[PDB]
């Protein structure tokens, strides 16, 4: 469960990301593909090479979806409803992979937000990402 304090931390941190989101998203995916190669099995059609146009474009979509969850942090399961169906019936990515990408997002944000990434913010963001992951994975069976 997210608390008032978590919601505040999450909004402040994502607020500083701003118009760098699509870019942090792409970096997170790249970090993911190099550190955990099994994840590449889900993108056999993508040119995954560094600087890939498909990768940057995909980071943007991941980022926008995270921005929509931040914007509706008190109604997440409904704001993400369409995304949760897509994952359950089409994408069907194994739950363990959501942790790998969450971790990579945290790394990406620590790498770019030295001042905002305090123990308490890191804790709230980790919780936030685990709730997003749970929503997107909630209709699997």
């Amino acid at each position: 469960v997210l608390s008032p304090a978590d919601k505040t931390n999450v909004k402040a941190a994502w607020g500083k990301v701003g118009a760098h989101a699509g870019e942090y998203g792409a970096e997170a995916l790249e970090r993911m593909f190099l550190s955990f190669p099994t994840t590449k099995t889900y993108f056999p059609h993508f040119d995954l090479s560094h600087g890939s146009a498909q990768v940057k474009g995909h980071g943007k979509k991941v980022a926008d979806a995270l921005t929509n969850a931040v914007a509706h942090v008190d109604d997440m399961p409904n704001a993400l409803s369409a995304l949760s169906d897509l994952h359950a019936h089409k994408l069907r990515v194994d739950p363990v992979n959501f942790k790998l990408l969450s971790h990579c997002l945290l790394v990406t944000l620590a790498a770019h937000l030295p001042a905002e990434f305090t123990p308490a913010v890191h804790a709230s963001l980790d919780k936030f990402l685990a709730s997003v992951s749970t929503v997107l994975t909630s209709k699997y069976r």
Partner: protein
């Protein structure tokens, strides 16, 4: 994988009594019912909308038997799982794009099925040995992932 000689033995003795046709079809069918997302890899097999369709689908059964065949060979090679499954690992990664995490799932389903069949005989010590075999197999199938 570090198997005790009596563990190596516990596994071999029981396997000797497995009906591969039945067990193979049952393990794969259950993987598809208990973990519906795995169905993404078998679209061509047909109707899999319900448990009955899945358990009755003859292609699922025939594929179950072939998978367990590869598995049997692995028990003849417990001291060299990596080499036995190298090309099968290349295949499952480069052509099929199967996330190895799925190997662990099939492994655990495979264990409940043996329990289901052998009952009292699938004792905790016997289970412990087969848990190592299944992890070992999962790890060898994952080896050539890059």
């Amino acid at each position: 994988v570090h198997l005790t000689p009596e563990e190596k033995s516990a596994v071999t003795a029981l396997w000797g009594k497995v009906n591969v046709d039945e067990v193979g079809g049952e393990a794969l069918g259950r993987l598809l019912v208990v973990y519906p997302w795995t169905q993404r890899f078998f679209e061509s097999f047909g109707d899999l909308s319900t448990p009955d369709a899945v358990m009755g689908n003859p292609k699922v059964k025939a594929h179950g038997k072939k998978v367990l065949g590869a598995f049997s060979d692995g028990l003849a090679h417990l001291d060299n799982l990596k080499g036995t499954f190298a090309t099968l690992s290349e295949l499952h990664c480069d052509k099929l794009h199967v996330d190895p995490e799925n190997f662990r799932l099939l492994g655990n389903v495979l264990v409940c099925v043996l329990a289901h069949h052998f009952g009292k005989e699938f004792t905790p010590p016997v289970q412990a040995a087969y848990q190592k075999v299944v992890a070992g197999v999962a790890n060898a199938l994952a080896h050539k992932y890059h």
